[PDB]
Design a protein around this ligand. Structure first.
Ligand SMILES: CN(C)C(=O)COc1cccc(F)c1
Ligand SMILES: CN(C)C(=O)COc1cccc(F)c1
Ligand SMILES: CN(C)C(=O)COc1cccc(F)c1
Ligand SMILES: CN(C)C(=O)COc1cccc(F)c1
Lengths: 192, 192
């Protein structure tokens, strides 16, 4: 009847569910399974409410989940989903390697380009102002509605998604051996 | 890279999380930990969305969670929370023993009495009409605003909560050895 030991067991189990749901979210994002992504995101968000003290590893896990959530809502606070993804990306405790900078740059341009794709050019300019010769050339492209300019074709949505999926594959392999998924695959392999 | 085996592992893990969250919900309800109950309920509801095919045991688990959720919202569809708890209680695949009938009767009267406690006597009559010499005596009590009649004092909110908590203790012991909580308590005992 020890309430403290029970709360401790509940916190250990919340940590296991968090890693399992991050793994599931990464796979759904990689596979393009939108409805499964939406369901796993709702589950991860609820499970995270059962945690009040997080380790550095757990903080990185929750911010990766938040970041992918903004990326998945990219084509849909007073900022756009892709602007929110950029704020999380720039503050996650991670190495600022070549891949990090590539994703950062692709998000910055796509935060503008998704507004143009949606036909909201005033919003495209407001996004540009909040993020940013280069600047005056990018603002002229938005102003001229030059949505299919070679610059936008190189810093494309598909290229942003491909680079982010490559990062998702590293998270997926770094968490492939976490307790809950490993025990669950063991049960499935035993059946069989 | 087998998507089917991964989805199978995700379903096995959803089953484990469901039993763990039912256990956690039962403890919070027994302890009167309202905020913890609200958080565990949100988590259970989200996790249950990741399941599309349930066994008879899993159906009983989800309906116990739904039932306690209605009981916890009892003093707050075109029916009241306690009327919804009654519909679930009468349809759960379980034995209709003495305890089942006691809980059923206490809920039926409290579904009326919580409306009187809230000062909504028109709603108390509408609840009576939907659920129901005995009937004409119960309707006269509502009509006379006889909230503290000896009948209401014997079929009280506290007596309803005590009887439901006794049932919760049976669910709690029947699920005490489920995979996730057992593995989590093992980690906690190892630290100590
Ligand atoms: C701060 N908010 C409201 C969010 O970022 C919601 O998104 C989330 C949150 C946690 C996990 C997840 F998978 C998604
Ligand atoms: C001289 N300057 C500022 C440049 O040519 C950099 O261009 C870029 C390209 C992509 C993203 C970005 F945010 C900036
Ligand atoms: C049918 N609805 C919307 C509900 O009953 C919500 O309540 C729930 C649902 C599942 C688990 C739980 F713990 C609570
Ligand atoms: C002759 N009759 C109908 C009775 O005296 C039963 O009284 C009850 C008592 C509690 C709950 C309930 F629903 C009914």
């Amino acid at each position: 009847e020890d309430a403290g030991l029970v709360a401790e067991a509940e916190a250990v189990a919340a940590g296991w569910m968090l890693d399992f749901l991050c793994l599931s979210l990464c796979r759904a994002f990689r596979d393009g399974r939108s409805e499964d992504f939406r369901r796993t995101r709702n589950s991860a968000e609820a499970i995270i409410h059962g945690l009040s003290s997080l380790t550095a590893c757990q903080l990185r896990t929750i911010y990766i989940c938040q970041f992918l959530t903004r990326i998945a809502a990219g084509k849909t606070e007073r900022i756009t989903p892709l602007e929110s993804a950029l704020m999380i990306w720039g503050s996650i405790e991670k190495e600022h390697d070549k891949l990090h900078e590539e994703i950062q740059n692709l998000i910055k341009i796509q935060a503008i380009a998704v507004c143009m794709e949606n036909g909201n050019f005033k919003e495209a300019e407001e996004v540009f102002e909040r993020i940013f010769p280069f600047k005056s050339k990018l603002l002229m492209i938005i102003s001229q509605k030059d949505t299919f300019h070679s610059f936008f074709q190189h810093f494309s949505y598909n290229h942003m998604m491909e680079k982010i999926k490559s990062y998702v594959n590293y998270v997926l392999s770094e968490k492939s051996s976490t307790f809950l998924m490993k025990a669950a695959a063991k049960v499935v392999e035993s059946k069989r």
